[PDB]
Design a protein around this ligand. Structure first.
Ligand SMILES: CCCCCCCCCCCCCCCC(=O)O
Length: 282
């Protein structure tokens, strides 16, 4: 039994994991005020170009999910490449119709497609994808994978925690009060598939502390973690966050992933966060 794993571009999947865990990325779309559209392709150069253009732009674009057809075409491509099963992990059904499209597309094809509503977004989504791969590489059934993801998600073993410096992007995006102050950072997490601002602080150092204190609300210091650090063109930022994370957690694996066009569009450049997988709570 051979299984393809598909995430959407809002998963901000690390480049190397695509080949390494056989995970593909399906683009969502970015639509600028003038009617120009671009896809969110997981390619380092394209993501970099976009960073340059959005820092510069006169406007902030909007985003749309992939169509049912975009999903159908991928599913069928996997079929003709002799996969037996497609496993799809999408961002929260509460943030996007991506899950809806993916599910509708599954009804128009022969090949069994299992669609999982992760109730997450960005660097948290690949964490359950990796785990699905590892347990398929150890002989598990699809049924066994889906049951385990559900248990772990319901234990809140996958978390998404981040800060932005300019809240207006999220507000324009529609998925989330906070006003304006010099050096403000707004801290958010995802809880039950929704975006929740939980703290306003000033400057990176306090913001970093706030993210880690939120994690600490249900995961004691010294727990075993795996982590994807995410950033919208702010490498130094995510690097400090990860360093600070190590002072109080056993990080058994980490990698950095730049946030794609869609996530960036909503969070704004400068953003820093992490997707966290708890392996073992102390
Ligand atoms: C892992 C930590 C970082 C988490 C960042 C999550 C930011 C989510 C922002 C909302 C994204 C909305 C995407 C909508 C896509 C669509 O148009 O259907």
């Amino acid at each position: 039994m051979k299984v393809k794993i598909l995430v959407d571009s809002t998963a901000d999947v690390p480049f190397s994991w695509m080949e390494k865990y056989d995970i593909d990325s399906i683009p969502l779309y970015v639509v600028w005020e003038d009617g120009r559209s671009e896809p969110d392709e997981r390619e380092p150069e394209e993501i970099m170009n976009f960073y340059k253009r959005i820092r510069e732009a006169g406007s902030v674009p909007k985003t749309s999910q992939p169509s049912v057809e975009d999903f159908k075409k991928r599913y069928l491509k996997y079929k003709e490449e002799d996969y037996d099963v497609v496993l799809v992990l999408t961002l929260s059904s509460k943030l996007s119709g991506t899950y809806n499209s993916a599910v509708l597309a599954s009804k128009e094809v022969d090949i069994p497609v299992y669609v999982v509503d992760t109730l997450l977004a960005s660097g948290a989504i690949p964490l359950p994808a990796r785990v699905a791969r590892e347990m398929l590489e150890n002989g598990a059934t699809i049924e066994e994978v889906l049951k385990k993801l559900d248990e772990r998600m319901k234990n809140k073993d996958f978390k998404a925690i981040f800060y932005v410096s300019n809240f207006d992007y999220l507000v324009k995006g529609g998925r989330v009060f906070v006003g304006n102050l010099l050096k403000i950072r707004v801290c958010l997490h995802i809880e039950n598939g929704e975006l929740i601002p939980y703290r306003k602080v000033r400057g990176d150092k306090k913001a970093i502390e706030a993210l880690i204190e939120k994690l600490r609300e249900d995961t004691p210091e010294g727990s075993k973690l795996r982590v994807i650090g995410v950033h919208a063109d702010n490498e130094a930022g995510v690097v400090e966050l990860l360093n600070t994370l190590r002072k109080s957690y056993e990080v058994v694996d980490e990698i950095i992933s730049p946030m794609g066009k869609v996530i960036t569009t909503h969070v704004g450049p400068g953003t820093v966060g992490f997707g966290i997988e708890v392996l073992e709570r102390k």
